[PDB]
Amino acid sequence: SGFRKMAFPSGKVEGCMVQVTCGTTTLNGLWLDDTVYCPRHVICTAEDMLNPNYEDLLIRKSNHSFLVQAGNVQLRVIGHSMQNCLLRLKVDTSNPKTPKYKFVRIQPGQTFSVLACYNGSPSGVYQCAMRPNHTIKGSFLNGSCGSVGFNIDYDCVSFCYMHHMELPTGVHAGTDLEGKFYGPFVDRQTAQAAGTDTTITLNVLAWLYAAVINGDRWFLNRFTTTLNDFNLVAMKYNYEPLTQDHVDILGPLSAQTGIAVLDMCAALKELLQNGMNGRTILGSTILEDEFTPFDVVRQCSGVTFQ
Amino acid sequence: SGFRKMAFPSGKVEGCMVQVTCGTTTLNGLWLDDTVYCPRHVICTAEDMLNPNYEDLLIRKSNHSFLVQAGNVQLRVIGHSMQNCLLRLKVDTSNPKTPKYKFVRIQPGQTFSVLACYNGSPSGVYQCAMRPNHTIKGSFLNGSCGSVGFNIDYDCVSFCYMHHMELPTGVHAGTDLEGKFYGPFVDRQTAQAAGTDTTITLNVLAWLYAAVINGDRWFLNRFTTTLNDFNLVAMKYNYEPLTQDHVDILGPLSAQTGIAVLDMCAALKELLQNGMNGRTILGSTILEDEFTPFDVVRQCSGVTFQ
């Protein structure tokens, strides 16, 4: 029982963190086998960030312009190249702690764990979701550029995010591990605001299912709804439109609880229209949208508390 | 700038988790140097255990009775004993991944990270607090017994909790690493239940200081209060009584912000009596109580772990 915003154990990622410095700029890098990945803006001074031309800035660097350190130990750079917004540095030694891994680009609304680091040293791990507008909703730790986001399946680490920039509203922007930004953001220190954001409907429904599996049914009702009528209501509350695909993804949770998906949608519609009347669900006074259906299945019992 | 709920990097603890099996009962154990620590109820019946006689049951147990597995390696048990509600199994191999560590007994209100584990394999990590009623609102499923809670200072892991039981309300109970339960709970099936709980005043105050440090300061006012008058109000809202010792613990945050603790208490009184009137504090609509003064100091000062 219980339900928490839990992250994946971070050990496999801890053993890959390093520090990368170019000039007076230092940030975190990810060391896998014989390569170190980091934001290309490490080659930029705050000044450069106003209107940088990375091709021109990088051609002026040599392998020895980069100092990579694992702890207090320097790793010699023997090659370098830029891949989109990432710098790939080949080093002369391999990381024996490299886990089995994959690079994946996640979709908005999906969740991942972030190992926040400073100067190549881990400070903490937290769980978050890629917002529909491609930003991450929490507050990052100072100097966390280069810290990465990941999910773990069995013993394979799927890296999906590298932190690059800080946004005006205080939200954060970054890229996947091929160096492509999530969202309409670029690595230039200029005002760029996030598009409008929405509540992740699929996740809110997943979470209501978690509450039922854990024994609570107070918010259910005797009504049902069509997908269309649900969207007509939910979209008035800034919720992402719900699609049949989303409905299909909720199949397993629906089968485990005996509550048809559209019946749970009728419950959510009422919660949006009438509020929670001072009550809580899974300890929260507001509807939570940072747990995917997969997160709920992984954390909750496969046996509903009837 | 930067502040959110985080767990400590779990790598150092992941390297200490093992699976301990006695017949049909399998749970988790903590492997440090040549000793494996685990809940003594690992030696109990099949899916139940009403009033077991532990000292008697241990007699009919040989070292060979205990199957300990670290990853895919069997660890040969060469000794066993009981220490309060824990079993200490001596194994023939000292854990190569043993971190610098200490065993500490935390106090109510204090926080720690929990590494949820099943079959000796780490599954997730989250931050939680020891509730004033000596239970933790964790997230645990069958097979999680033996999972541990800890804090990390520099490179030293302070273990403070080992998981043993789930109570009727879905909250959790366990012991320190000397095998002594937190609270009046016992490792047997009884009618034991969690007592009433209170909000952790000290932590709510620490969080308001975190808010101020991060620029969220609309709730501050020009007044103050006596401790007694604050408690008269807080207690009506089911907040733990604030003591002079708690006021002292907040000294570092009060000094950093220049806001006297009793002045912050006056701000909190106003929040409890009038609510937020729509506004938010660090993005929250409610007052958070699972960040200690130390968590705030560590996070807002940028500490990392080696």
Coordinates of C-alpha atoms in Angstrom, one line a residue:
Chain A
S1 CA 0.0 0.0 0.0
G2 CA 0.9 3.7 -0.2
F3 CA 1.8 5.6 -3.3
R4 CA 4.9 7.9 -3.8
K5 CA 6.6 9.8 -6.6
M6 CA 9.4 7.4 -6.9
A7 CA 12.5 7.5 -9.0
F8 CA 14.5 4.6 -10.5
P9 CA 17.5 3.6 -8.3
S10 CA 20.3 5.9 -9.6
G11 CA 23.5 3.8 -9.1
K12 CA 23.9 2.8 -12.7
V13 CA 23.9 6.4 -13.7
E14 CA 26.0 7.6 -10.8
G15 CA 28.9 5.5 -12.1
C16 CA 28.8 7.4 -15.4
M17 CA 28.9 11.0 -14.2
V18 CA 32.0 13.1 -14.9
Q19 CA 32.9 16.8 -15.0
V20 CA 33.8 18.6 -18.3
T21 CA 35.5 21.9 -18.4
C22 CA 36.4 24.2 -21.4
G23 CA 38.1 27.4 -20.3
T24 CA 36.2 28.6 -17.2
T25 CA 33.0 26.8 -18.1
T26 CA 32.3 23.6 -16.2
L27 CA 29.3 21.3 -16.2
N28 CA 28.4 17.6 -16.1
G29 CA 29.1 15.0 -18.7
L30 CA 27.9 11.4 -19.2
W31 CA 30.7 8.8 -19.6
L32 CA 29.8 5.6 -21.5
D33 CA 32.5 3.2 -22.6
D34 CA 35.1 5.5 -24.2
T35 CA 32.9 8.5 -24.9
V36 CA 31.8 11.5 -22.9
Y37 CA 28.6 13.3 -23.8
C38 CA 27.8 16.9 -22.6
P39 CA 26.0 20.0 -23.7
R40 CA 27.9 21.7 -26.5
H41 CA 27.5 25.1 -24.7
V42 CA 30.4 24.1 -22.5
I43 CA 32.5 25.7 -25.2
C44 CA 30.6 29.0 -24.6
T45 CA 31.2 31.8 -22.2
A46 CA 28.1 33.5 -20.9
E47 CA 29.0 36.1 -23.5
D48 CA 29.0 33.6 -26.4
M49 CA 25.6 32.4 -25.3
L50 CA 23.9 35.6 -26.5
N51 CA 24.4 34.6 -30.2
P52 CA 26.8 31.7 -30.5
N53 CA 27.9 30.0 -33.7
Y54 CA 28.9 26.6 -32.5
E55 CA 30.7 25.5 -35.7
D56 CA 32.9 28.6 -35.5
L57 CA 33.5 28.3 -31.8
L58 CA 34.3 24.6 -31.9
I59 CA 36.8 24.7 -34.8
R60 CA 38.9 26.8 -32.6
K61 CA 39.3 24.0 -30.0
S62 CA 41.6 21.1 -29.8
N63 CA 41.2 17.8 -28.0
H64 CA 43.3 19.3 -25.2
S65 CA 41.1 22.3 -24.8
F66 CA 38.8 19.9 -22.9
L67 CA 39.5 18.7 -19.4
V68 CA 37.3 15.7 -18.4
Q69 CA 37.5 14.5 -14.8
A70 CA 36.1 11.4 -13.1
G71 CA 36.3 12.5 -9.5
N72 CA 39.7 14.0 -9.1
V73 CA 41.2 12.0 -12.0
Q74 CA 41.7 13.5 -15.4
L75 CA 40.6 11.5 -18.5
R76 CA 42.5 12.4 -21.6
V77 CA 40.4 13.5 -24.6
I78 CA 41.6 11.9 -27.9
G79 CA 38.8 13.0 -30.2
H80 CA 35.8 15.3 -30.4
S81 CA 32.8 16.0 -32.5
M82 CA 29.5 17.8 -32.3
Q83 CA 26.1 16.0 -32.8
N84 CA 23.3 18.4 -32.9
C85 CA 23.5 20.2 -29.5
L86 CA 25.8 17.7 -27.8
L87 CA 29.6 17.4 -27.8
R88 CA 30.9 13.8 -28.0
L89 CA 34.4 13.5 -26.5
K90 CA 36.4 10.3 -27.0
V91 CA 38.7 9.7 -24.0
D92 CA 41.6 7.3 -23.7
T93 CA 40.1 5.0 -21.1
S94 CA 36.8 3.1 -20.9
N95 CA 34.3 3.3 -18.1
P96 CA 34.0 -0.1 -16.6
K97 CA 30.8 0.9 -14.8
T98 CA 29.0 1.5 -18.1
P99 CA 25.6 -0.2 -17.8
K100 CA 23.7 -1.8 -20.6
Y101 CA 22.0 1.2 -22.1
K102 CA 20.0 2.7 -25.0
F103 CA 19.4 6.3 -26.1
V104 CA 15.6 7.0 -26.5
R105 CA 13.6 10.1 -27.3
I106 CA 10.6 10.2 -25.0
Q107 CA 7.1 11.5 -25.7
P108 CA 5.5 14.4 -23.9
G109 CA 3.5 13.1 -20.9
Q110 CA 6.0 10.3 -20.2
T111 CA 8.0 10.2 -17.0
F112 CA 11.7 9.7 -16.1
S113 CA 14.2 10.0 -13.2
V114 CA 16.8 12.8 -13.1
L115 CA 20.0 12.5 -11.2
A116 CA 20.8 16.1 -10.4
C117 CA 24.6 16.6 -10.3
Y118 CA 27.1 19.5 -9.7
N119 CA 30.6 19.5 -11.0
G120 CA 30.3 15.8 -11.9
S121 CA 29.0 14.8 -8.4
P122 CA 25.5 13.5 -7.7
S123 CA 23.4 15.4 -5.3
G124 CA 19.9 13.8 -5.5
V125 CA 17.5 11.9 -7.6
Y126 CA 13.9 12.9 -8.4
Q127 CA 11.1 11.8 -10.7
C128 CA 9.4 14.0 -13.2
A129 CA 7.4 14.2 -16.4
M130 CA 8.0 15.7 -19.8
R131 CA 5.2 18.3 -19.9
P132 CA 3.0 18.5 -23.0
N133 CA 4.9 21.7 -23.8
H134 CA 8.3 19.9 -23.5
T135 CA 9.5 21.6 -20.3
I136 CA 10.1 19.9 -17.0
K137 CA 8.0 21.3 -14.1
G138 CA 10.2 21.3 -11.1
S139 CA 13.0 23.5 -10.2
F140 CA 16.5 22.3 -11.1
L141 CA 19.5 22.5 -8.9
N142 CA 22.0 25.3 -9.5
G143 CA 24.7 24.3 -12.0
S144 CA 22.9 21.1 -13.0
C145 CA 23.6 21.4 -16.8
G146 CA 24.6 18.1 -18.2
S147 CA 22.6 16.1 -15.6
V148 CA 20.6 13.4 -17.3
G149 CA 17.1 11.8 -17.3
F150 CA 16.5 8.1 -17.5
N151 CA 14.3 5.1 -17.0
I152 CA 15.5 1.6 -16.2
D153 CA 14.1 -1.7 -17.5
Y154 CA 15.6 -4.8 -15.8
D155 CA 19.2 -3.7 -15.9
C156 CA 19.2 -1.6 -19.1
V157 CA 19.3 2.2 -18.7
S158 CA 17.3 4.1 -21.2
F159 CA 18.7 7.7 -21.2
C160 CA 16.2 10.2 -22.5
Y161 CA 17.2 13.6 -21.4
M162 CA 20.2 15.9 -20.8
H163 CA 19.7 19.2 -19.1
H164 CA 20.8 22.3 -21.1
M165 CA 19.0 25.5 -20.1
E166 CA 17.0 27.5 -17.6
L167 CA 13.7 29.2 -18.7
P168 CA 12.3 32.6 -17.6
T169 CA 9.3 31.1 -15.8
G170 CA 11.8 28.9 -14.0
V171 CA 11.1 25.7 -16.0
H172 CA 13.8 23.7 -17.7
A173 CA 14.8 22.7 -21.3
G174 CA 17.1 20.1 -22.6
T175 CA 17.7 17.5 -25.3
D176 CA 17.6 13.7 -25.9
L177 CA 21.0 11.9 -26.1
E178 CA 21.3 12.5 -29.8
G179 CA 21.4 16.2 -28.9
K180 CA 18.0 17.2 -30.3
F181 CA 16.0 19.6 -28.1
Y182 CA 12.6 18.8 -26.7
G183 CA 10.4 21.6 -27.6
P184 CA 11.0 24.8 -29.7
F185 CA 14.1 25.7 -27.7
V186 CA 17.7 26.4 -28.8
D187 CA 20.9 26.7 -26.8
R188 CA 21.2 30.5 -26.8
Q189 CA 20.6 32.6 -23.7
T190 CA 17.6 34.5 -24.9
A191 CA 13.9 34.7 -23.9
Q192 CA 12.1 31.7 -25.3
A193 CA 8.9 30.9 -23.5
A194 CA 7.1 27.5 -23.3
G195 CA 4.0 27.1 -25.5
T196 CA 0.9 26.6 -23.5
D197 CA 0.8 23.6 -21.2
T198 CA -2.0 21.2 -20.4
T199 CA -2.8 18.7 -17.7
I200 CA -1.8 15.1 -18.8
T201 CA -5.3 13.5 -18.9
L202 CA -4.1 9.9 -19.4
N203 CA -1.9 10.2 -16.3
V204 CA -4.7 11.7 -14.1
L205 CA -6.9 8.8 -15.1
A206 CA -4.0 6.3 -14.3
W207 CA -3.7 7.8 -10.9
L208 CA -7.4 7.6 -10.1
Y209 CA -7.0 3.9 -11.0
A210 CA -4.1 3.7 -8.6
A211 CA -6.3 5.1 -5.8
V212 CA -8.9 2.4 -6.5
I213 CA -6.4 -0.4 -6.5
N214 CA -5.2 0.9 -3.2
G215 CA -8.7 0.8 -1.8
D216 CA -10.4 4.1 -2.4
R217 CA -13.6 4.6 -4.5
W218 CA -15.1 7.8 -3.0
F219 CA -14.9 9.8 -6.3
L220 CA -16.7 7.3 -8.5
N221 CA -20.2 7.8 -9.6
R222 CA -23.1 6.1 -11.4
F223 CA -22.5 7.8 -14.8
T224 CA -20.6 7.0 -17.9
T225 CA -19.6 9.3 -20.8
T226 CA -18.7 9.2 -24.4
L227 CA -15.2 10.1 -25.3
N228 CA -16.5 13.1 -27.1
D229 CA -18.6 14.4 -24.2
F230 CA -15.6 13.9 -21.8
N231 CA -13.3 16.0 -24.0
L232 CA -16.0 18.7 -24.3
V233 CA -15.7 19.1 -20.5
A234 CA -12.1 18.3 -19.8
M235 CA -10.8 20.7 -22.5
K236 CA -12.5 23.5 -20.6
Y237 CA -10.2 22.8 -17.7
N238 CA -7.0 22.9 -19.8
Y239 CA -6.7 19.1 -20.0
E240 CA -5.1 17.4 -23.0
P241 CA -7.7 15.9 -25.3
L242 CA -8.2 12.1 -24.6
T243 CA -8.0 9.7 -27.5
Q244 CA -9.0 6.1 -28.1
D245 CA -5.3 5.1 -28.0
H246 CA -5.2 6.6 -24.4
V247 CA -8.4 4.7 -23.6
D248 CA -6.8 1.5 -24.9
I249 CA -3.6 2.0 -22.8
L250 CA -5.8 2.1 -19.7
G251 CA -7.2 -1.4 -20.5
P252 CA -5.1 -3.4 -18.0
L253 CA -5.9 -1.0 -15.1
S254 CA -9.6 -1.1 -16.1
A255 CA -9.6 -4.9 -16.1
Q256 CA -7.9 -5.0 -12.7
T257 CA -10.4 -2.7 -11.0
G258 CA -13.5 -3.6 -12.9
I259 CA -14.1 0.1 -13.7
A260 CA -14.6 0.7 -17.4
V261 CA -12.4 3.5 -18.8
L262 CA -15.3 5.7 -19.8
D263 CA -16.8 5.2 -16.3
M264 CA -13.5 6.5 -14.8
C265 CA -13.8 9.4 -17.2
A266 CA -17.2 10.2 -15.9
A267 CA -15.7 10.3 -12.4
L268 CA -13.0 12.7 -13.5
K269 CA -15.5 14.9 -15.3
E270 CA -17.5 15.2 -12.0
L271 CA -14.2 15.9 -10.0
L272 CA -13.4 18.7 -12.5
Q273 CA -16.9 20.2 -12.4
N274 CA -17.5 19.9 -8.6
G275 CA -14.1 19.8 -7.1
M276 CA -12.8 17.5 -4.5
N277 CA -14.8 19.1 -1.7
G278 CA -11.9 19.3 0.6
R279 CA -11.2 15.6 0.3
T280 CA -8.0 13.9 -0.8
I281 CA -7.0 11.1 -3.2
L282 CA -3.8 9.2 -2.4
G283 CA -3.0 11.9 0.1
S284 CA -3.3 14.7 -2.5
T285 CA -5.7 17.6 -2.5
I286 CA -5.3 18.1 -6.2
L287 CA -5.4 15.8 -9.2
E288 CA -1.9 14.4 -10.0
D289 CA -0.7 14.0 -13.6
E290 CA 2.9 12.9 -13.3
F291 CA 2.3 9.1 -13.0
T292 CA 1.9 7.2 -16.3
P293 CA -0.3 4.1 -16.5
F294 CA 3.0 2.2 -16.7
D295 CA 4.2 3.9 -13.4
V296 CA 0.9 2.9 -11.7
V297 CA 1.2 -0.8 -12.8
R298 CA 4.8 -0.9 -11.7
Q299 CA 4.1 0.6 -8.2
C300 CA 0.7 -0.7 -7.3
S301 CA -0.3 -4.2 -6.3
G302 CA -1.6 -6.5 -9.1
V303 CA -4.3 -7.3 -6.6
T304 CA -7.0 -4.6 -6.0
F305 CA -8.0 -4.0 -2.3
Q306 CA -11.7 -4.7 -2.9
Chain B
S1 CA 18.2 29.1 -6.8
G2 CA 16.5 25.7 -7.0
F3 CA 14.5 23.5 -4.7
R4 CA 12.3 20.3 -4.8
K5 CA 11.8 17.0 -3.0
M6 CA 14.7 14.7 -3.8
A7 CA 16.0 11.3 -2.6
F8 CA 19.7 10.8 -2.0
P9 CA 21.6 9.0 -4.9
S10 CA 21.0 5.3 -4.1
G11 CA 24.0 3.7 -5.6
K12 CA 25.9 3.1 -2.4
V13 CA 22.9 1.3 -0.9
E14 CA 22.1 -0.6 -4.1
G15 CA 25.5 -2.3 -3.8
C16 CA 24.5 -3.7 -0.4
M17 CA 21.1 -5.3 -1.2
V18 CA 20.8 -9.1 -1.3
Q19 CA 18.0 -11.7 -1.3
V20 CA 17.6 -13.9 1.8
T21 CA 15.5 -17.0 1.6
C22 CA 14.3 -19.4 4.3
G23 CA 12.1 -22.1 2.9
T24 CA 9.2 -20.4 1.2
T25 CA 9.8 -16.9 2.6
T26 CA 12.0 -14.5 0.7
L27 CA 12.8 -11.0 1.7
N28 CA 15.7 -8.5 1.4
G29 CA 18.9 -8.2 3.4
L30 CA 21.6 -5.5 3.8
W31 CA 25.1 -6.8 3.2
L32 CA 27.9 -4.8 4.9
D33 CA 31.4 -6.3 5.2
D34 CA 30.8 -9.9 6.1
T35 CA 27.4 -9.6 7.8
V36 CA 23.9 -9.7 6.2
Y37 CA 21.2 -8.0 8.2
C38 CA 17.5 -8.8 7.7
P39 CA 14.1 -9.0 9.5
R40 CA 13.9 -12.0 11.8
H41 CA 10.5 -12.9 10.5
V42 CA 12.2 -14.3 7.4
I43 CA 12.0 -17.6 9.3
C44 CA 8.2 -17.5 9.6
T45 CA 5.4 -19.9 8.4
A46 CA 3.6 -19.5 5.0
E47 CA 2.1 -16.1 4.3
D48 CA 1.4 -15.6 8.0
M49 CA 2.8 -15.7 11.6
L50 CA 0.6 -15.2 14.7
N51 CA 2.7 -15.0 17.9
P52 CA 5.8 -16.9 16.7
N53 CA 8.5 -17.9 19.2
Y54 CA 11.6 -16.5 17.5
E55 CA 14.2 -17.7 19.9
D56 CA 12.8 -21.2 19.6
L57 CA 12.5 -21.2 15.8
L58 CA 16.0 -20.0 15.4
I59 CA 17.3 -23.1 17.2
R60 CA 15.9 -25.4 14.5
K61 CA 17.7 -23.3 11.9
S62 CA 21.2 -24.2 10.5
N63 CA 23.4 -21.9 8.5
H64 CA 22.5 -24.0 5.4
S65 CA 18.9 -23.1 6.0
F66 CA 19.6 -19.5 4.9
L67 CA 20.0 -19.0 1.1
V68 CA 21.6 -15.6 0.5
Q69 CA 21.9 -14.4 -3.0
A70 CA 23.8 -11.3 -4.2
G71 CA 23.0 -10.8 -7.8
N72 CA 23.5 -14.3 -9.3
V73 CA 26.0 -15.3 -6.6
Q74 CA 25.2 -17.5 -3.6
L75 CA 26.8 -16.2 -0.4
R76 CA 27.7 -19.0 2.0
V77 CA 26.4 -18.4 5.5
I78 CA 28.8 -19.4 8.2
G79 CA 27.1 -18.0 11.2
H80 CA 23.8 -16.7 12.4
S81 CA 22.3 -14.9 15.4
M82 CA 19.4 -12.7 16.4
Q83 CA 19.7 -9.1 17.6
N84 CA 16.3 -7.8 18.7
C85 CA 14.1 -8.0 15.6
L86 CA 16.9 -8.6 13.1
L87 CA 18.9 -11.6 12.1
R88 CA 22.7 -11.1 11.6
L89 CA 24.0 -13.7 9.1
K90 CA 27.8 -14.0 8.8
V91 CA 28.8 -14.8 5.2
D92 CA 32.1 -16.0 3.9
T93 CA 32.6 -12.9 1.7
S94 CA 33.0 -9.3 2.8
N95 CA 31.0 -7.1 0.4
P96 CA 33.4 -5.4 -2.0
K97 CA 30.8 -2.6 -2.4
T98 CA 30.6 -1.8 1.3
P99 CA 30.4 2.0 1.7
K100 CA 31.6 4.0 4.6
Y101 CA 28.6 3.7 6.9
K102 CA 27.0 4.2 10.3
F103 CA 23.8 2.9 12.0
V104 CA 21.7 5.7 13.4
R105 CA 18.3 5.9 15.1
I106 CA 16.4 8.9 13.7
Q107 CA 13.9 11.0 15.6
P108 CA 10.2 11.6 14.7
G109 CA 9.9 14.2 12.0
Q110 CA 13.2 13.5 10.4
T111 CA 13.5 12.5 6.8
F112 CA 15.4 9.8 4.9
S113 CA 15.4 8.0 1.5
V114 CA 14.0 4.6 1.1
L115 CA 15.3 2.1 -1.5
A116 CA 12.3 -0.2 -2.2
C117 CA 13.6 -3.6 -3.0
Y118 CA 12.1 -7.0 -4.0
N119 CA 14.0 -10.3 -4.3
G120 CA 17.2 -8.5 -3.5
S121 CA 16.7 -6.2 -6.6
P122 CA 16.3 -2.5 -6.1
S123 CA 13.1 -1.2 -7.7
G124 CA 12.7 2.5 -6.8
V125 CA 13.8 5.2 -4.4
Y126 CA 11.8 7.9 -2.7
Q127 CA 12.1 10.4 0.2
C128 CA 9.9 10.1 3.2
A129 CA 9.6 11.2 6.8
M130 CA 9.3 9.4 10.1
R131 CA 5.8 10.5 11.2
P132 CA 5.2 11.9 14.7
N133 CA 3.2 8.6 15.2
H134 CA 6.3 6.5 14.4
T135 CA 5.1 5.2 11.1
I136 CA 6.2 6.1 7.6
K137 CA 3.9 6.7 4.7
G138 CA 5.8 4.6 2.4
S139 CA 5.0 2.6 -0.8
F140 CA 5.6 -1.1 -0.3
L141 CA 4.3 -4.3 -1.7
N142 CA 4.7 -7.9 -0.4
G143 CA 8.3 -8.9 -0.6
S144 CA 9.6 -5.5 0.3
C145 CA 10.5 -6.4 3.9
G146 CA 14.2 -5.7 4.5
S147 CA 14.3 -2.6 2.3
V148 CA 16.2 0.1 4.1
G149 CA 16.0 3.9 4.7
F150 CA 19.1 6.0 4.9
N151 CA 20.8 9.4 4.7
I152 CA 24.1 10.2 3.1
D153 CA 26.6 12.8 4.5
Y154 CA 29.6 13.2 2.3
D155 CA 30.6 9.6 1.5
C156 CA 29.1 8.1 4.6
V157 CA 25.8 6.3 4.5
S158 CA 23.8 6.5 7.7
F159 CA 21.3 3.6 7.7
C160 CA 18.3 4.4 9.8
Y161 CA 15.4 2.2 8.9
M162 CA 14.7 -1.4 7.9
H163 CA 11.2 -2.3 6.8
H164 CA 9.1 -4.9 8.6
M165 CA 5.4 -4.5 8.5
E166 CA 2.3 -2.8 6.9
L167 CA -0.4 -1.6 9.4
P168 CA -4.2 -1.5 8.7
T169 CA -4.2 2.0 7.4
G170 CA -1.6 1.2 4.8
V171 CA 1.2 2.9 6.6
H172 CA 4.5 1.2 7.5
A173 CA 6.5 0.2 10.5
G174 CA 10.0 -1.0 10.9
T175 CA 13.2 -0.9 12.9
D176 CA 16.6 0.9 13.2
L177 CA 19.6 -1.3 12.2
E178 CA 20.0 -2.6 15.7
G179 CA 16.6 -4.3 15.3
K180 CA 14.6 -2.0 17.6
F181 CA 11.2 -0.9 16.3
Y182 CA 10.3 2.7 15.9
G183 CA 7.0 3.1 17.8
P184 CA 5.3 0.5 19.9
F185 CA 5.0 -2.0 17.0
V186 CA 6.0 -5.7 17.2
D187 CA 6.8 -8.2 14.5
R188 CA 3.8 -10.4 14.9
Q189 CA 0.1 -10.3 13.9
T190 CA -1.8 -8.3 16.5
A191 CA -4.5 -5.6 16.5
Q192 CA -1.7 -2.9 16.6
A193 CA -2.6 0.2 14.6
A194 CA -1.1 3.6 13.9
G195 CA -2.1 6.2 16.5
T196 CA -3.3 9.7 15.5
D197 CA -0.7 11.7 13.6
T198 CA 0.2 15.4 13.5
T199 CA 1.7 17.7 11.0
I200 CA 5.5 18.2 11.5
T201 CA 5.6 21.9 12.4
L202 CA 9.3 22.1 12.4
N203 CA 9.5 20.9 8.8
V204 CA 6.6 23.2 7.7
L205 CA 8.6 26.1 9.1
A206 CA 11.8 24.9 7.4
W207 CA 9.9 24.8 4.1
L208 CA 8.6 28.4 4.5
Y209 CA 12.3 29.3 5.0
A210 CA 13.1 27.4 1.8
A211 CA 10.3 29.4 0.1
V212 CA 11.7 32.7 1.3
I213 CA 15.3 31.7 0.2
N214 CA 13.8 31.0 -3.3
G215 CA 12.0 34.4 -3.5
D216 CA 8.5 33.2 -2.5
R217 CA 7.8 35.6 0.4
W218 CA 4.3 37.0 0.1
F219 CA 3.2 35.3 3.4
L220 CA 5.6 37.2 5.6
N221 CA 4.2 40.0 7.8
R222 CA 5.4 42.7 10.2
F223 CA 4.2 40.9 13.4
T224 CA 5.5 38.2 15.8
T225 CA 4.1 35.9 18.4
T226 CA 5.0 34.1 21.6
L227 CA 5.7 30.4 21.4
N228 CA 2.7 29.7 23.6
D229 CA 0.3 31.7 21.5
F230 CA 1.6 30.0 18.4
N231 CA 1.0 26.5 19.9
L232 CA -2.4 27.5 21.0
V233 CA -3.2 28.1 17.4
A234 CA -1.1 25.4 15.7
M235 CA -2.5 22.6 17.9
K236 CA -6.0 23.5 16.9
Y237 CA -4.9 22.7 13.3
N238 CA -3.4 19.4 14.4
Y239 CA 0.2 20.6 14.2
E240 CA 2.8 19.2 16.5
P241 CA 3.6 21.6 19.4
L242 CA 6.7 23.7 18.7
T243 CA 9.4 23.5 21.4
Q244 CA 12.2 25.9 22.1
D245 CA 14.5 23.1 20.9
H246 CA 12.7 23.2 17.5
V247 CA 13.2 27.0 17.5
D248 CA 17.0 26.5 18.0
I249 CA 17.2 23.9 15.3
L250 CA 15.8 26.6 12.9
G251 CA 18.5 29.0 14.0
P252 CA 20.7 28.6 10.9
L253 CA 17.8 29.2 8.5
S254 CA 16.6 32.1 10.6
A255 CA 20.1 33.6 10.5
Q256 CA 20.4 33.2 6.7
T257 CA 17.1 34.9 6.0
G258 CA 17.2 37.4 8.9
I259 CA 13.7 36.3 9.8
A260 CA 13.2 35.4 13.5
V261 CA 11.6 32.0 14.0
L262 CA 8.7 33.5 16.0
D263 CA 8.2 36.0 13.2
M264 CA 7.9 33.1 10.8
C265 CA 5.5 31.4 13.2
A266 CA 3.4 34.5 13.0
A267 CA 3.3 34.1 9.2
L268 CA 2.4 30.4 9.6
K269 CA -0.4 31.3 12.1
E270 CA -1.9 33.6 9.5
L271 CA -1.6 30.9 6.8
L272 CA -3.4 28.4 9.0
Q273 CA -6.2 30.8 10.0
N274 CA -6.8 32.4 6.5
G275 CA -5.5 29.9 4.0
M276 CA -3.6 30.9 0.9
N277 CA -6.3 32.9 -0.8
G278 CA -5.5 31.3 -4.1
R279 CA -1.7 31.9 -4.1
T280 CA 1.0 29.2 -4.0
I281 CA 4.2 28.6 -2.1
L282 CA 7.0 26.9 -4.0
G283 CA 4.3 25.9 -6.5
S284 CA 2.3 24.1 -3.8
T285 CA -1.3 24.9 -2.6
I286 CA -0.6 23.1 0.7
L287 CA 2.0 23.4 3.5
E288 CA 4.6 20.7 3.0
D289 CA 6.0 18.9 6.1
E290 CA 8.5 16.4 4.8
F291 CA 11.6 18.7 4.3
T292 CA 13.7 19.1 7.5
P293 CA 15.7 22.2 8.3
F294 CA 18.8 20.1 7.3
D295 CA 17.2 19.2 4.0
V296 CA 16.7 22.8 3.2
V297 CA 20.2 23.9 4.2
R298 CA 21.8 21.1 2.2
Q299 CA 19.7 21.7 -0.9
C300 CA 19.8 25.5 -0.8
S301 CA 23.6 25.5 -0.2
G302 CA 24.3 23.2 -3.2
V303 CA 25.8 20.1 -1.4
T304 CA 26.7 17.0 -3.4
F305 CA 27.9 13.6 -2.4
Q306 CA 31.2 11.8 -3.0

